[PDB]
Each structure stands twice: as C-alpha cells, then as structure tokens.
C-alpha cells in the first residue's frame, strides 16, 4: 500500500483518486492519500472551488518512485513532483499517519472496478502519450488537444494518441477502396494491430486510457479517441474471438462507471447505435448492449 | 460545401469542375419467375460526367457484364460509379483535371472521396440544387450508344451542340435543364415539342436540333409550358 502525501492544501478544491473524490476546504489540515493499491496505475485529479474549469490530474504508478502533491501559488495548481531522498519522504509519510492527517484509498474488498477500467494501461504507454520525459507521471487537463485534433496547436502539451481516420490512405489500400471502406479488418489488423499496436493489449491500453481522460477531465479529444477504437473494431469483420469477448467486457465497466448525468456529452449516438444495431459485431457485445440498453435507452 | 441556388455563377467561372451523375448506371426491369416470384434483369446504363462550362460530357458506358456475380448492386454501383470517375479524372492531363466535382446524389460523397484520396486538393461537393440529369437516356443519340454496347466504353459528346458559339455557358446550362426537366416530366411531350416540324433537323454530329435563335424562344416557352401544366395535374394546383 502506497502513500501520496500533500505538502498543504491552501486552497479549496475537488480531490478525485481514481473513481472517488473528496471535498478539502481552504486550509484544511489535508496531508495526501494513503493505502493506495499497488499494482495499478492511478490518477490523482482536481477541481478548484472557485473556477470548476479546467479539472487537471496526474497519472502515476507508485512502484515508479516516491511522489506527493504541493501547491504552487504562482502557477495556482496542485503539481506532482517526485522526492528522490527516499528516508526524508518515509519520514514525511510516517509522521502525517501518525496524525490522521491522510484520507485511506476507500476500495471495496469485492470491487474489481479500478482494476477493470485499467486493465491494459502502463505507465510506459501513458508517457509516449503524454511526453513529458523528465517526471515519471504524467499530467492531463480538460484542455489538452490531441495530434489528431491539431491537425485540422502547441505540440509539447499535445495528447499523442494514434491518428485513425477511416478515409485516409492509411486505412484504404489502392484497388481495395470499397472493401476496405465497409469492412475495416484490414486497417485494424495489419495496419494498427501489427503495425502500430504490436497487440491487442497495447490497443485496449490506448483505448482504456482515452475513455478515463474523457470521463475524469472531460477531454474531447479523448472521447473522440475513445469512440474512433471503438468503431474500428466493431466496423471489422474479421477479428480475433479473444479481442470480441475482451472489448465487451472493457465497455461494460466503462459504461457501467460513467455518471449518469454525462452520457449526454460522453456518448456518441452515431457509433454507439451504429456498433450495437448495424455493425458487424451487433450481436458480439452482449453485456455492453444489455447495460447500454438498461442505463441509456434514450441515446439509443 | 453544397452547390445551391446562391452560389450558382460558380458553375461557369474558369476553375474546372465536373458533374457527376450516377442514376442511370444501375438498372433494371422488374419481372415474374415462372414460379410468380420477382426477379431483375440489368440493363445497360452509363455515368453522366458533364463540364457545365464547356459542355464536355464524358459518358462512360455500363455494360451489365461488369454486375455478374456481385452483390449488393445499388451499393456496388456507387463504388463503381467513383471507380471510373476516379479513372477518368488519371487519364486527363493535369492542366484538364477538375479543381471540384460536384456529385448530384449525396450517397456518392463517401464512394467518391475514398476513390480520390490520391487528388486531396480535388473538392468532392453535393449540391442542393434537383437536377433533371437522370432524364439523359431521353436523348435518342445516348440511349442509343448505351444499349448498343456489347463492352464498358467511353464516349465523348459536347451536350450543348454548337449553342456556345451564340450564348453564353450560363444560358446554355439553364436550356440543357429546361430541357431535361421537360422530358423528365412528360418525355412524349418534350420528344414531340422537339421533332413536330420536320424541316428542322438534328445534324450529324450533334444531340438537339438545329434551331434559329427565335426557334429556341418558342420551343423553351412550350418546354415551360409542359412542366407547368404537368405540375397542376401532380398536386391539384
């Protein structure tokens, strides 16, 4: 069980960790974040009091080294750094349990949920997304573009996820223009399973990844991330029975974690009515489809 | 984006640009089976490609030899239909290729742009406006090459005759689809408004007969005539 201790908390602000969140009041005696499970990734995240735009966040692995959060009253947020003096951060951590100063990671024995919406995702491929090379953690924000996004402006706070376009040369192979049009199992099993990915699991890992960036920090450019691998998947013909059941059991736990009170501007209607009721996989998706049609029955 | 009634001109400036109408490329007749189901037979059809500017229509010819054994033909034929326009647009030496293609159904868009994602500053753009170009097999002289064909060919035609030599492209565009209208509309009617006086003729080399100034004012005022008498019978107005 891992700590991420805070320096302070001099201002008023929404603390998430994974899928929970807590209140601080300004000045509250707030000292970080205990019992955090090991292996997995996590992400630390914040909404200030007085301005509910821009929530930000820090994804992290605690195996990774010693972080903790600290307030920056120039640049007015809560920033991660790492504390390479490993007895100075033991030290720190020790005494602020000592005095119940730390909120404990509250899982449920029985809840496989974090586990579930993380599955795939490694802090290797989150910071060849996020290119921040110097930390071992990496920061995301409401506002951040993707390359993709670019394209059609700043590259260093870019999100470098991979660029799918289903009317690209990419995905269309001379001579097979109809084809590969209508059934994508070209562009998605030699071009980006072989090609890019190297394997499914590096693809569920983006697409994990995309879908907790939209959720947590309303990123659009994530959403759309996350809807476009979905779509390339369900607009194949040919894919492996392994990714199937896979893919459905990852959508569950996405649709089953997102508030209900977001599906308005988290949930595509073109891909979703389009990948449970006309794609080639309508009828591979059997528990995203029940929960879809049992949570969100007006979307569809 | 879409070619409409306000940015109409645009059809007649200098920048080349190329209709595409896929309507009569696949078709058909309807029929019985000995055993009194339903079965289609295809015929032949074409691609109508036309320079609004120039007049320059580039028919190329549908042979239904080019359906045997394929599925799905109404979705092939739009695939199809952007294959060959995708071939033609390669054939033209670069200073002759389109700067747009103006598709007068919207379902050509996606079929089109994929074929032409090597020519990405070529502008694939539906338009607004109800053209009359499914009415070219009207024209004796296509339907004629059409069902003739015993192959895929290509055939060129100027659509105007030799009008561009007394008016202007914009005049000549709006009689082209006075006309198609018409026979669109009542093909009989327009076929005899066309041919009633026998000393008018249709030369050689041309599509349409060869009418004095004053002979296309009457024949475009019957052909007005025709769609207006036409449209109080389909509505009771």
Redesign the interface.
């Given at each position: 069980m891992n700590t991420v201790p805070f320096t302070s908390a001099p201002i008023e602000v929404t603390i998430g960790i994974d899928q929970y969140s807590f209140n601080v009041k300004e000045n509250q005696p707030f000292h970080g974040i205990k019992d955090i499970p090991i292996g997995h990734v996590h992400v630390i995240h914040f909404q200030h009091a007085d301005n509910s735009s821009m929530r930000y966040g820090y994804w992290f692995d605690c195996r990774m080294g010693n972080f903790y959060i600290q307030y920056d009253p120039k640049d007015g947020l809560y920033k991660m750094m790492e504390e390479r003096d490993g007895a100075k951060f033991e030290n720190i951590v020790h005494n602020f349990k000592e005095r119940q100063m730390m909120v404990s990671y509250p899982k449920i024995d029985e809840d496989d949920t974090w586990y579930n919406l993380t599955e795939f995702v490694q802090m290797d491929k989150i910071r060849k997304i996020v290119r921040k090379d110097e930390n071992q953690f990496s920061y995301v924000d409401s506002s951040m573009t993707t390359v993709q996004e670019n394209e059609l402006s700043d590259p260093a706070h870019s999100l470098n996820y991979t660029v799918i376009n289903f009317?690209?040369?990419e995905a269309?192979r001379?001579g097979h223009?109809?084809e590969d049009?209508?059934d994508k199992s070209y562009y998605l099993n030699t071009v980006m399973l072989q090609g890019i990915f190297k394997n499914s699991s590096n693809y569920f890992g983006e697409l994990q990844f995309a879908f907790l960036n939209a959720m947590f920090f309303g990123n659009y450019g994530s959403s759309l991330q996350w809807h476009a691998m979905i779509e390339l998947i369900c607009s194949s013909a040919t894919v492996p029975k392994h990714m199937l059941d896979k893919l459905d059991e990852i959508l569950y736990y996405q649709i089953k974690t997102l508030p209900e009170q977001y599906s308005d501007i988290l949930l595509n209607e073109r891909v979703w009515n389009i990948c449970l009721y006309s794609s080639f996989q309508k009828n591979s998706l059997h528990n995203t489809e029940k929960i879809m049609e049992n949570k969100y029955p007006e979307l569809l | 984006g879409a070619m409409n009634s306000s940015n109409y001109a645009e059809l007649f400036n200098n920048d080349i640009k190329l209709f595409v109408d896929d309507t009569n490329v696949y078709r058909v007749t309807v029929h019985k089976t000995f055993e009194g189901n339903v079965a289609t037979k295809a015929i032949n059809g074409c691609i109508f490609t036309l320079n609004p500017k120039t007049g320059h229509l580039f028919l190329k010819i549908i042979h239904t030899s080019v359906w045997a054994g394929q599925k799905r033909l109404s979705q092939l034929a739009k695939w199809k239909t952007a294959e060959e326009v995708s071939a033609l647009v390669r054939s033209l030496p670069k200073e002759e290729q389109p700067k747009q293609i103006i598709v007068t159904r919207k379902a050509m868009l996606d079929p089109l742009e994929v074929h032409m994602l090597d020519f990405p500053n070529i502008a694939i753009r539906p338009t607004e406006l109800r053209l009359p170009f499914s009415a070219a097999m009207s024209i004796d002289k296509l339907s004629d090459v059409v069902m003739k064909a015993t192959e895929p060919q290509m055939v060129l035609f100027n659509i105007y005759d030799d009008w561009l030599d007394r008016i202007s492209s914009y005049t000549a565009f709006s009689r082209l689809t006075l006309l198609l209208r018409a026979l669109k509309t009542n093909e009989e009617s327009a076929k005899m408004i066309l041919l009633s006086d026998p000393t008018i003729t249709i030369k050689s080399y041309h599509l349409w007969p060869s009418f004095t100034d004053e002979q296309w004012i009457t024949i475009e005022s019957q052909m007005r005539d025709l769609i207006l008498t036409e449209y109080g019978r389909k509505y009771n107005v």
């Open positions: 009317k690209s040369r269309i001379p223009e109809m049009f209508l | -």
